């Protein structure tokens, strides 16, 4: 919930650690009918495989739980991803400042807290 | 003062040797001194590339005369030896010509490099 997508790419450029890119053709969902797979949805699928390898059996999707996990996840694509990078997070409105803000109890509240920080 | 003038700096040569490479892949590249002259004679050359260490240099100083008559940019790289691989070809090249094609896949960085070459001139 706290994570804001646009922020973590700055970590990526500023991490200085590689990113483990996949193959050009291995990313397209289905012959191009579904656009290039977004970065997040590649992070979800590997959880399935990393989940699938240990359990020793695949996970089937219930007919109900099916009906709210592919279309909009491939229609947010058709609305929002054009080429495997999302154009949707921006039309959305969010208060990222709370995620940036040092809202925790360990926050500058008096002149002495910030002075101790500067030490 | 020098006959080989202007000479691209270390950086500018790299972008030029780049656009040279994809051109060889896309059949937009005519290389060698006489082909440069022919592409110049027909006026299909958007800009030419020549080498400053040609042995002797004098065998490619016709091309500056041809281009400046017609307003085509030209620029020099330190090495004819380096200009070879960018052409994708097993021998040194002292002069090569990228041709005019508004229908080419690689237009954008050509006009980017072609933007810089006139600034150098």
């Amino acid at each position: 919930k706290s994570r804001m997508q646009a922020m973590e790419e700055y970590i990526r450029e500023s991490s200085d650690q590689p990113d483990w890119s996949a193959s050009i053709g291995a990313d397209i969902v289905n012959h191009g009918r579904g656009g290039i797979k977004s970065l997040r949805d590649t992070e979800k699928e590997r959880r399935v495989t990393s989940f699938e390898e240990d359990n020793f059996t695949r996970l089937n999707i219930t007919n109900k739980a099916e009906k709210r996990k592919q279309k909009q996840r491939e229609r947010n694509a058709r609305m929002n991803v054009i080429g495997g990078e999302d154009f949707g997070i921006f039309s959305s409105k969010r208060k990222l400042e709370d995620s940036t803000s040092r809202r925790g109890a360990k926050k500058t509240r008096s002149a002495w807290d910030r002075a101790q920080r500067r030490l | 003062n020098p006959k080989a003038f202007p000479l691209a700096d270390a950086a500018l040569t790299q972008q030029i040797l780049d656009v040279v490479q994809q051109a060889a892949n896309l059949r937009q590249l005519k290389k060698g001194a006489n082909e440069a002259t022919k592409t110049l004679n027909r006026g299909i050359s958007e800009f030419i590339i020549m080498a400053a260490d040609c042995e002797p240099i004098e065998i490619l100083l016709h091309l500056p005369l041809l281009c400046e008559d017609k307003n085509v940019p030209y620029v020099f790289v330190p090495s004819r030896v380096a200009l070879g691989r960018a052409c994708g070809v097993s021998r040194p090249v002292i002069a090569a010509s990228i041709t005019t094609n508004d229908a080419s896949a690689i237009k954008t960085q050509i006009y980017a490099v072609k933007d810089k070459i006139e600034t150098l001139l």
């Binding site: 053709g25 291995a26 012959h31 109900k64 709210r68 154009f87 400042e97 | 980017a112």
Partner: protein, 181 residues
């Protein structure tokens, strides 16, 4: 039952479909890029409008704002990965300077025509729809596939396609068989 779902349209009909300037605008865009219908032009205009509206909203904000800086740089990073914006236009005003023709130029059928693999835009579309084009290793039959730069160079003919090294198609082998017979 269980919760319903959010889905939306990828396009919007123009404010006035009937001004002549518009009509011949779709005419030449279609003809040069070889589209099927005006539906694709309304599609592409729709996202271009969304992108420019976001860019304008980010312009309205004062310099150095967390909002403007974060989201504007994210617009531009993604717009440069798609290849639409060059590396030297890393600014949001130049996002506001964008046009539909650049997106259409990023459509795969343009690249298949453009690299020399096809001799007409319609031939490029036929080749794509006919399982002859591979971006890297993977076969695409959607002309509306937009191409990245790293993906731009990896456009080749399919290993399975007859022109890319596979056996001749049905017509060629049929002709050879009747010639032998």
């Amino acid at each position: 039952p269980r919760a319903p779902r959010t889905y939306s349209k990828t396009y919007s009909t123009p404010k006035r479909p009937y001004e002549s300037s518009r009509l011949d605008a779709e005419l030449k865009l279609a003809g040069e890029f070889g589209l099927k219908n005006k539906k694709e032009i309304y599609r592409i205009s729709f996202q271009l409008s969304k992108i420019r509206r976001a860019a304008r909203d980010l312009l309205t904000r004062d310099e150095k704002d967390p909002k403007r800086l974060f989201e504007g740089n994210a617009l531009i990073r993604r717009l440069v990965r798609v290849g639409v914006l060059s590396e030297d236009k890393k600014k949001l005003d130049y996002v506001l300077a964008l046009k539909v023709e650049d997106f259409l130029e990023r459509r795969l059928q343009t690249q298949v025509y453009k690299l020399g693999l096809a001799k007409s835009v319609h031939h490029a579309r036929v080749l794509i729809t006919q399982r002859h084009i591979a971006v890297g290793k993977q076969i695409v039959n959607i002309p509306s596939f937009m191409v990245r730069l790293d993906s731009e160079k990896h456009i080749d003919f399919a290993p399975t396609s007859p022109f890319g090294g596979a056996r001749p198609g049905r017509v060629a082998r049929r002709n050879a068989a009747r010639k032998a017979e």
